[PDB]
Design a protein around this ligand. Structure first.
Ligand SMILES: CCO/N=C/c1ccc(OCCCCCN2CCN(c3ccncc3)C2=O)cc1
Lengths: 297, 58, 245, 58, 50, 58
């Protein structure tokens, strides 16, 4: 039980975050109202104070004499699902015959979509994102040919044994989900849920994953958040003998049921690495085109 | 239907209208979203709101 | 009546006679973690007045050639007062913040500072200039402590992103002819209900001159910029021995 | 159904009867149209209409 | 007949000139009222802006 | 429907919600199970149960 006044009148513990704004339905662009001339003192819509941090509240109606316009232009194509639910390339896997990389007929792809600029720049507009996804796998030879070859795709979550060869015991796949498909079949396609231990994935993590001294040799882990590491995607030609053809698997991702928080400035320098925002210091370019003078087009 | 509520948007402020044939709802289509917007959250997050007609600083 | 203000919290009070209102980031006030959002089971400690108060941590000198600076939260406070002690003794932490950046001059000086809060402010390097070296920023640059750190390339915010779009984040401007301070209130921002105050910086505070400082020979040339901030609704959990990193 | 009304003929004078399986109605079939006609618009756009029995000019 | 809103809500054609002042009868000079001392802040009759 | 009740779980303590297109129910999907649990059967199979607050042996 409580008794001293400061404890009784305390606000310690208030879990309801007071919000200063609320969403309103807006299926179409705003209409324009008829306006006429105003010759007033005191009333001054055009004057603002950008220092405050808010955007101008001046509208067409108060800056010029407007007519009435019934605007029925839709706002549907700018919803997050409209913008993001379009499949784009996020990974590529090579299974060559006589090669440098994967000459063993199998390959492990680390599930990270930041290796491709188009997709990466789009998602990086937001800090946190939560979504389900549809992954499609397009396989063919390097010339775009289709051959009668059977493949096995397996999702290996963190902690499950990664196959180390085309004949690894891990392909028994008694618990991991696997897909068996021919190159001649249409592209394999599946639905993936939101799997992070966190409420959302985050494209930016300003911190370290562990405690301790953060010396030179460990600086590679700055910005690394395990909540974003969903595992490995493994692929192999299904057989005990080497395949007769070289293969390429392109991975497409289509987000769906998307939620996003905290928008940020959009990337304006070329990407160099997947794990970080490093940019080439000797090639810092302006965000856009330039001209010779401010008084000429 | 009588499926698992495991979609990423389960319990969201906006309601969706989707299609599905499996017991897990995250397998469903993207569907149509609800068209609500809240520009002020980003464009006008001031404590004491000022009018259009007024002088912002006084 | 919008230019004048008083901020009182704990045993500290701030006054200003040339304010430009107050920004409440993303339109919401700091609040404690609800019983349904929470996951850790131990009863938290909520020190109240001894940690939710104003701390004046640093002063920088604004010069005609300054590039701008940044500080990381809660990093700037991890070693200060009762707040710091709690952040060190506990694994879990969460809180909001009231940031008050100060800078006054004279009616004959000019210049404008952009003061903004950028969540998950990840720093990048220049990749050896040519972009072939995969360098990484050192601890002293990612978590600069109370002294903050000076931006190397403000145009891209040392992270490959345009400062021209930084206003999409909660911000205010200190335009000398208008105001002498910026006040921004930020709620807890993370994808988890609580997190480590040591390993993770929830957001960065950027103070960058966009319109350079200027004045005529003879006017006071030393124009300081001081950073004062207050935690709000601080909560801590997962108690053990104190740890600095 | 509960689809987007983005067909090219949305809000037309004639009603169609079509089939569709997607959320966008422009994906629908061509269907059957309504059989209305207005020849006069082109064949008889005169201000003061004259009869069949009458002498057109008088 | 009219139909577009800007035409309906138009003031084009208003022939009545709005007057800000009006005449009052004044057959004699104005009288003088008793007045006393005023020692106020805020009230300032003597100050003008020509 | 009107199918044979030859599923391996016919007459089980928990009810399932499955899909099928054949006359034999064992051809049906795995579906969703009922979420009942009985830990005590293995973790606390004592004849005379003791409280949490009490001293287990007295
Ligand atoms: C039979 C096997 O089929 N399974 C296919 C499969 C496909 C995708 C899959 O998981 C895809 C998760 C995509 C998450 C991508 N994210 C989350 C955030 N993130 C990230 C990357 C780099 N830095 C920060 C975050 C990412 O790259 C699991 C299985």
């Amino acid at each position: 039980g409580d008794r001293v006044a400061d404890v009784i009148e305390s606000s310690i513990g208030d879990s309801v975050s007071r919000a200063l704004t609320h969403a309103l339905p807006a299926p179409t662009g705003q209409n324009t109202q008829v306006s006429s001339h105003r010759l007033d003192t005191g009333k001054v819509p055009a004057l603002q104070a950008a220092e405050i941090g808010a955007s101008s509240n001046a509208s067409d109606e108060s800056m010029i004499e407007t007519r009435c316009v019934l605007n029925s232009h839709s706002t549907a194509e700018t919803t997050l699902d409209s913008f993001f639910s379009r499949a784009g390339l996020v990974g590529e896997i090579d299974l060559p015959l006589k090669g440098t990389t994967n000459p063993n007929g199998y390959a492990n792809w680390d599930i990270d979509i930041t290796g491709y600029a188009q997709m990466r720049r789009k998602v990086e507009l937001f800090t946190y994102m939560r979504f389900d996804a549809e992954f499609t796998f397009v396989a063919c030879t390097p010339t775009g040919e289709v051959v009668p070859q059977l493949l096995q795709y397996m999702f290996v979550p963190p902690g499950a044994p990664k196959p180390d060869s085309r004949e690894s015991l891990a392909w028994q796949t008694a618990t991991n989900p696997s897909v068996f498909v021919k190159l001649s079949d249409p592209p394999a396609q599946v639905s993936v849920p939101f799997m992070s231990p966190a409420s959302a994935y985050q494209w930016f993590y300003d911190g370290y994953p562990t405690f301790g001294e953060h010396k030179q040799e460990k600086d590679l882990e700055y910005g690394a958040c395990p909540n974003n590491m969903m595992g490995t995607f493994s692929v192999r030609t299904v057989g005990t003998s080497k395949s007769k053809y070289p293969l390429v698997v392109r991975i497409y991702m289509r987000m769906k049921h998307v939620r996003a928080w905290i928008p940020r400035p959009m990337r304006n320098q070329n990407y160099l690495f997947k794990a970080n925002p490093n940019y080439a210091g000797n090639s810092i370019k302006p965000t856009g085109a330039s001209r010779t003078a401010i008084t000429t087009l | 239907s009588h499926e698992n509520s495991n979609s990423a948007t389960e319990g969201s402020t906006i309601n969706y209208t989707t299609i599905n044939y499996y017991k897990d709802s995250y397998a469903a289509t993207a569907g149509k979203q609800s068209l609500k917007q809240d520009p002020d959250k980003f464009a006008n997050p001031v404590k004491d709101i000022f009018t259009e007609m007024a002088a912002p600083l006084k | 009546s919008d230019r004048v203000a008083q901020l009182t919290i704990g045993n500290s009070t701030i006054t200003t006679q040339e304010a430009a209102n107050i920004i409440v980031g993303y339109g919401e006030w700091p609040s404690y973690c609800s019983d349904s959002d929470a996951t850790a089971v131990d009863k938290p400690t909520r020190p109240d007045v001894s940690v939710n108060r104003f701390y004046t941590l640093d002063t920088k000198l604004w010069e005609k050639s300054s590039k701008g600076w940044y500080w990381k939260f809660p990093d700037v406070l991890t070693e200060t007062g009762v707040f710091g002690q709690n952040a060190q003794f506990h694994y879990l932490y969460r809180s909001g913040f009231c940031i008050h950046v100060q800078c006054n001059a004279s009616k004959f000086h000019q210049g404008a500072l952009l003061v903004a809060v950028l969540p998950e402010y990840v720093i990048g390097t220049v990749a050896g200039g040519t972009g072939t070296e995969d360098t990484h920023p050192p601890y002293k640059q990612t978590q600069p402590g109370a002294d903050g750190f000076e931006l190397q390339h403000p145009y891209v915010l040392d992270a490959g992103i345009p400062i021209s779009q930084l206003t999409v984040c909660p911000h205010q401007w200190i335009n000398l002819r208008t105001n002498n301070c910026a006040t921004i209130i930020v709620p807890y921002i993370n994808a988890l209900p609580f997190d480590s105050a040591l390993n993770h910086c929830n957001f960065g505070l950027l103070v960058v001159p966009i319109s350079p400082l200027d004045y005529d020979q003879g006017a006071t040339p030393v124009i300081p910029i001081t950073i004062t901030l207050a935690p709000m609704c601080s909560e801590f959990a997962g108690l053990r021995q104190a740890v600095t990193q």
